[PDB]
Symmetry: D2
């Protein structure tokens, strides 16, 4: 995976997550400069890890003014943007117990802000004829007990990816989505006791490949779709879930024998 994006500028919302950092590292390795937009303060340490190749701009993407200031800062230090990876999300989700206020807050963060960040960067993507990668999930294709806000948000991102692709094609902009499964996480690393081999064995029941996915494995699909190798890929959903989405409630274990 030795893609060349020398001189290009990329924007990565929600870059403080393990997936985010892997996407940032993948872009830097390809020669691109990256601007990390996030509300989490740990993004600053990630940006400093790459020195002048990556910049961190703490941004509340629900604030239109914060987005305009972030794009102004990107223009001042880095330049015109070619790639946008919308990875920002909230895990505010209590299913039926979540309130109307929680719903609108989660939708604003997970969905509406993706439109505003794309709009603030549109003239850049139009001039650069760039590409956009949004993030769906296996939760956008299936129901999970007790989780409403994030699955519905991700199912909405999936449709937004298609409508953006259609209405952005005239300007030469490609828009796709990436659908990962269970990926090694900061939250999983803490609840597991930083025990990967046990967390992998728990995940084996839901992934044909028998483990959690690595952030790097997700980042590879993001870079491919951003690169010109995917020059005829737009509006598509690229699954990187180790086979999660090919299975149903029976999993990968036989079910008929239980009847006897």
């Amino acid at each position: 995976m030795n893609i060349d994006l020398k001189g290009k500028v990329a924007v990565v919302s929600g870059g403080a997550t393990l997936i985010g950092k892997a996407v940032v590292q993948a872009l830097v390795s390809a020669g691109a400069h990256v601007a990390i937009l996030d509300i989490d303060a740990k993004g600053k340490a990630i940006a400093e890890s790459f020195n002048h190749d990556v910049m961190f701009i703490q941004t509340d993407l629900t604030s239109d003014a914060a987005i305009q200031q972030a794009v102004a800062d990107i223009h001042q230090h880095l330049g015109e943007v070619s790639y946008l990876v919308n990875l920002a999300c909230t895990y505010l989700d209590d299913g039926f117990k979540s309130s109307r206020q929680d719903w609108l807050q989660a939708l604003d963060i997970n969905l509406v802000s993706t439109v505003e960040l794309s709009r603030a960067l549109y003239n850049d993507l139009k001039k650069q004829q760039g590409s956009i990668v949004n993030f769906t999930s296996i939760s956008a294709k299936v129901a999970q007990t007790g989780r409403w806000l994030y699955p519905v948000s991700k199912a909405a991102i999936r449709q937004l990816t298609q409508s953006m692709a259609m209405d952005f094609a005239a300007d030469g902009i490609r828009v796709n989505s990436v659908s990962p499964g269970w990926t090694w996480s900061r939250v999983i690393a803490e609840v597991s006791g930083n025990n990967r081999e046990k967390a992998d064995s728990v995940a084996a029941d839901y992934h044909l490949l028998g483990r959690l996915g690595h952030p790097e494995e997700v980042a590879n699909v993001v870079l491919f779709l951003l690169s010109s190798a995917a020059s005829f890929v737009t509006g598509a959903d690229y699954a990187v879930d180790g086979g999660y989405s090919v299975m149903g409630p029976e999993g990968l274990q036989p079910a008929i024998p239980r009847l006897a």
Copy 2:
């Protein structure tokens, strides 16, 4: 389609539309008492045609107080609710031009309000072990130039229908969705000059059956899902689109010959 729902009470949000009116008539014909919830005043005339079996309650479903008051009125005049048909929607939609405020307004009406209305009626549906029918569209499965808010909202309804089905199954409540195509509407009647055969001639290009759908044809599918005949149907999306969703950009005309 001679189902018996005598004595059962149904609630139909967005009942002032042609679809709503057909669903109301279908339920009344089946012996049910109906409460019409809508922000449009044309619902008042619809309820009066059925005398004491149908009630109209002008309701802004984005107002929690309005929902509580609407359920209180249903309790006083009709009683415990068995069926909820979530048909309320807004067509506030300017594609990419729609603002952040427009996004949240459309999501509040189309999606979040469905949750609050379901929550206010949940104890009724649980005691009656009723069924819920949400409304998706052909727009939830495909992209349409210049239309973002309504397609994305309906794509979100599809996932909400699945998560509602899962978390409501334990209480014996079935939740499904209906996906219609181009159906004869008030808006089509005005742009058409109340010319149905002319509007049918345009829609033939997008429906295998060569016309717009009738509101009654949609209501038939709604009534089936509400009835006990659909007793093993939950979490499903039932298409009533005259073949719209089996086609792609080529339509129903050959395309290869055009290359010669």
Copy 3:
């Protein structure tokens, strides 16, 4: 579910199964005459159960001559056909171990014969402007360990339903598919020891409604799609799986807590 199909003639392939008999009973109750085409000899006892309302014709649907003779017999005793329910299938399936010969045999029975039976009856369905119901499964939407031939066959039936719908619409024929989950079976009844409550509890892990589906519940969806109430439904897949297809490998039980 009190549909009126008085005087109409229906054809039910594979009518010897429990689903088949329920579909036959549903049609008779609606006033239709039914011809059961099947290779199983137990269909004769089913036909005699309805006396002159149902006729049995032992037919090897892989034999073109057998199909022509069956349609000739239907014309002699019953008349012009209005409804065709393609329920015939084989469970010849050993996954990767199944041979090329097994593959072509299963595809011929499950898929190709559906085309020939439809072709032999086409002029009837064209004159009567009838409807066709094919049978998919939850296995057409998901992978099941050790089962290749039947899932692939059913996934192919799903596409065939769409292509038939498109190319049959000009003649006023509607074509749809029905996708059931685990339904109480002859095979399940024997391996379970005719113990339904235990078989239901095993199936609860894969169906939101917590049991196997009843053949009658599947038959209701078949009759609806055949009837004129579904007059704007063509090319659609109507799920009657109790919520099986909304779930993934996590089922309906929490999965995050296992990580701790």
Copy 4:
């Protein structure tokens, strides 16, 4: 797209097509040795252009003996196989007019032969822990007037890809599918008069990116899935259709204004 597959051996059925040729070049450029299997003699000229790195073996994949002989020749000249790209297909397709014999012939070539070729190479892929790429189409997700056999065959390939992924995962083999749209082909070049801009002008109505896809653009997606960058991708369908599959019968043009 600078992947290193030095020393690895790949097999490409149906390698005489433009897609096949692009996939062969992509693999050779990545350092792999390639065996071209095809019934078309034009594959012989393709292999000779790469000298000793690419081999051509004229093979009727419906003949079990031909497959065993083809694997024997691969073993003698190149060695153990790591990658299998199932691209062989037939366009024998007359829609409803196709006969039972035509159906089984098309299914044998398009679908069943993929199983036999995979079975003959399985021990290689298991020892090498390789990956398999099957070919679906935009025709597997939508109906096209007058075309049954190829759309249904490809819809069956999609499910086979999922069941292969599940039952091959235990052995470390990844299986995915690629779904292209209208791609520049030999057949299009002949009806087009070898006029690409004219063929592009027709395809713009069905692809958001306004042209036919290049064979290389499809090959890029095939190469990614074969490579270790897709190490958490199994059982997925990767669309490379220029936005074809996000559209419905309305295409990318507004349709509501037509009603006025």
